[PDB]
Amino acid sequence: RGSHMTPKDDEFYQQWQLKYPKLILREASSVSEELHKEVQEAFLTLHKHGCLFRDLVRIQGKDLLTPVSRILIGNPGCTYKYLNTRLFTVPWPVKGSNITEAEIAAACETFLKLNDYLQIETIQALEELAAKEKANDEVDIKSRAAYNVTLLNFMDPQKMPYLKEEPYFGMGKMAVSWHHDENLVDRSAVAVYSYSCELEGRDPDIWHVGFKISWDIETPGLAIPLHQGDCYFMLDDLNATHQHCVLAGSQPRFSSTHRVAECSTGTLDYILQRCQLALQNVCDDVDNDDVSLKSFEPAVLKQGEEIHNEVEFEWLRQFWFQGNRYRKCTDWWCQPMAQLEALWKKMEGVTNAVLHEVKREGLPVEQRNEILTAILASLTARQNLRREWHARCQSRIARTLPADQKPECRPYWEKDDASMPLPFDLTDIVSELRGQLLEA
Ligand SMILES: O=C(O)CNC(=O)c1ncccc1O
Numbered sequence: 536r537g538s539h540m541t542p543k544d545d546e547f548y549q550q551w552q553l554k555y556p557k558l559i560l561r562e563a564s565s566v567s568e569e570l571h572k573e574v575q576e577a578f579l580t581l582h583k584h585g586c587l588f589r590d591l592v593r594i595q596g597k598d599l600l601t602p603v604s605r606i607l608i609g610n611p612g613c614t615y616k617y618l619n620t621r622l623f624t625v626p627w628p629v630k631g632s633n634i635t636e637a638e639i640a641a642a643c644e645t646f647l648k649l650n651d652y653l654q655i656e657t658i659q660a661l662e663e664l665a666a667k668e669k670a671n672d673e674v675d676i677k678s679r680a681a682y683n684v685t686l687l688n689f690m691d692p693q694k695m696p697y698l699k700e701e702p703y704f705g706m707g708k709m710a711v712s713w714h715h716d717e718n719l720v721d722r723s724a725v726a727v728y729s730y731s732c733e734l735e736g737r738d739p740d741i742w743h744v745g746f747k748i749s750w751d752i753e754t755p756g757l758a759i760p761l762h763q764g765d766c767y768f769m770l771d772d773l774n775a776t777h778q779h780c781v782l783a784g785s786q787p788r789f790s791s792t793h794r795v796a797e798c799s800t801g802t803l804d805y806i807l808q809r810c811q812l813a814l815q816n817v818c819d820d821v822d823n824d825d826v827s828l829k830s831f832e833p834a835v836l837k838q839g840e841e842i843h844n845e846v847e848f849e850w851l852r853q854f855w856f857q858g859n860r861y862r863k864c865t866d867w868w869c870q871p872m873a874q875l876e877a878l879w880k881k882m883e884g885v886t887n888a889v890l891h892e893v894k895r896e897g898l899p900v901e902q903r904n905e906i907l908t909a910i911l912a913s914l915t916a917r918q919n920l921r922r923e924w925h926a927r928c929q930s931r932i933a934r935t936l937p938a939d940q941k942p943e944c945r946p947y948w949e950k951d952d953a954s955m956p957l958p959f960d961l962t963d964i965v966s967e968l969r970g971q972l973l974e975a
């Protein structure tokens with residue numbers, strides 16, 4: 536049978552060294568009492584103000600509410616995407632940032648302080664790691680520790696008892712199943728501060744993090760006990776070569792999971808830049824509904840429609856699916872999402888202008904068909920993704936969420952809405968374009 540090891544097992548320490556060396560543990564003792572106090576009060580503050588929410592994610596095609604409640608804190612404008620869900624940062628006061636309620640703002644400051652400390656600890660550990668490997672660059676080390684977000688977790692096993700059994704090693708109840716972390720910079724470290732409020736194998740009353748080798752249930756897994764204020768670090772390629780899970784104890788527990796999000800297509804600045812690139816193809820003297828395009832070159836049109844999808848689905852639908860929970864903690868994304876929606880709306884104008892050109896009496900058919908081939912893939916994806924998002928918004932599990940967390944299918948409009956140049960449902964349009972492309 537599959538098995539696991541804990542500190543109670545004589546082989547635990549040599550197995551940790553042999554098969555899990557890029558896992559590091561810094562016990563609560565190594566962290567100042569002052570910092571423990573601040574961070575723990577910050578967790579409690581965010582809980583009290585109701586800032587942590589179960590996420591309605593998607594896994595193997597199913598809509599699932601995570602047992603764990605979460606909140607993303609981090610650099611202004613940054614996002615972190617996991618399980619098909621793009622989380623938007625509640626901003627921490629990074630330098631040269633401007634300005635959201637007193638206690639919440641203090642809490643985010645605290646997690647930035649914690650971020651600074653864990654970053655220092657991580658750099659030190661990566662230096663020690665390389666030196667160990669020397670017995671056989673500094674910019675890389677710095678970048679692999681440059682945490683830009685933390686994903687905070689909370690779970691009360693007494694209130695959230697509906698937990699699955701760990702299936703391979705007898706590790707008991709899981710708060711989070713076996714996984715690799717998503718959307719991390721390659722070989723970037725993860726630092727976790729773990730805060731638990733107050734036999735054969737691992738103690739069921741105590742929280743652990745479990746590790747196993749990928750693809751491998753023969754090598755016994757490790758279960759690392761996590762007491763109040765213990766920290767652990769996944770270094771270098773550990774996240775790739777191994778999987779981990781979180782094993783529930785009996786008491787409520789928070790954690791702060793500091794990460795280097797791979798946010799190359801995942802910041803507000805990046806997506807604003809994309810929108811601006813798309814709108815370079817629009818005559819921009821005045822903001823009205825008489826949208827006219829500078830070029831119908833296929834490459835340019837394809838690009839514009841791709842950007843249209845990107846802002847629609849990766850930004851707007853993601854944001855509003857989450858029911859503006861952020862707004863409880865911060866108004867930071869309010870103006871940005873209004874601006875992103877206006878940019879998108881102009882892009883609906885653009886699509887209409889391309890459709891109008893395609894129908895233009897004097898357009899030679901060869902040019903028309905070139906345009907159709909340029910845009911069809913994007914419009915097809917737009918239709919399919921609109922169906923998916925609309926259903927994801929209307930799913931049974933979605934409809935049970937409280938009113939302050941209810942998914943909002945947005946943008947959405949009825950065919951009777953004269954403010955929108957095109958219908959929400961593109962079935963007919965896509966069908967017609969396809970048929971045109973096949974005309975003899
Ligand atoms: O709470 C922990 O100790 C470890 N958390 C995780 O492994 C984790 N991973 C990905 C996304 C959210 C998480 O909470």
Ligand SMILES: [Zn+2]
Nearest residue numbers: 714715716779
């Ligand atoms: Zn994880």
